[PDB]
Structures are given as C-alpha cells and as structure tokens.
Amino acid sequence: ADKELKFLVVDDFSTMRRIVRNLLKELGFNNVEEAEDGVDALNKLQAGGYGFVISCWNMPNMDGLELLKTIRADGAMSALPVLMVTAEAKKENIIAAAQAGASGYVVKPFTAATLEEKLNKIFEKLGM
C-alpha cells in the first residue's frame, strides 16, 4: 500500500481519534485528518484527496452507517475504503455494515498489529 494514503479518522471522541492516528503513525501512515461526526466527515471528504476512511459506528447527528451509505452512493468516492470501528461486536451491526459495503469492521480496543491486519486485507481486497 501507499504509506502516503490520506486517511480520515472519524469519531466524536477526540481520544479515540488520537489512538487511531497514533496506531496508523506506528504503521507508517502519517497522512491523517480527523472528523467528529458523519457530517463533518462528508464536508472533509468533499474537499477531496482522501484514500481511506476509518469510522466509529456510533456518532451523533450522522453515525458510521449513514456516513458509509452516503459515501457508497457518491459517484466520486463510491469505492473509498471504509473500515468501521466499534466497541461492541453485534451480529446485526456487522451484517448491516457488510451489506452497506463496509470494507471491514474491527472491535476496539485494537493494537497496531490488529489494525495492520485489517488494513492489509482491505488493501489486497482492493488490489491497493
């Protein structure tokens, strides 16, 4: 993969965003920006040049699922990789995400090695 891939880390918890950003940094992905909700994420993706989205499932105003659905329906970003992050694995959330086209899903807290594994599988899957 391209270590310069521009990531957008979405979560209403700044601590959670910080974690994710540091784990990416640990894997050598330094190009990272943050969004506090689905709306903010879309405003940012509309600026352009993003290559990957890592989004929390639960956020006020526009949750991860709605954001994901919006991205997938967007002509220009319809295939942007979207990894969903959740603190609780629920069979239904997983299925719902898959179906809406989530690139992957991970339960937090996770380590850089777990993240790496998820990212590599999506990169490959997307022949990235």
From Swiss-Prot:
Positions bearing N6-acetyllysine: 91, 108
Biological processes, Gene Ontology terms: archaeal or bacterial-type flagellum-dependent cell motility; chemotaxis; phosphorelay signal transduction system
Cofactor note: Binds 1 Mg(2+) ion per subunit.
GO cellular component: cytoplasm
Alphabetized UniProt keyword annotations: Acetylation, Chemotaxis, Cytoplasm, Flagellar rotation, Magnesium, Metal-binding, Phosphoprotein, Two-component regulatory system
Keyword match Cytoplasm: yes
Modification type 4-aspartylphosphate: residues: 56
Domain Response regulatory: from-to ranges: 6-123
Function: Involved in the transmission of sensory signals from the chemoreceptors to the flagellar motors. In its active (phosphorylated or acetylated) form, CheY exhibits enhanced binding to a switch component, FliM, at the flagellar motor which induces a change from counterclockwise to clockwise flagellar rotation.
Protein name in UniProt: Chemotaxis protein CheY
Organism field: Shigella flexneri
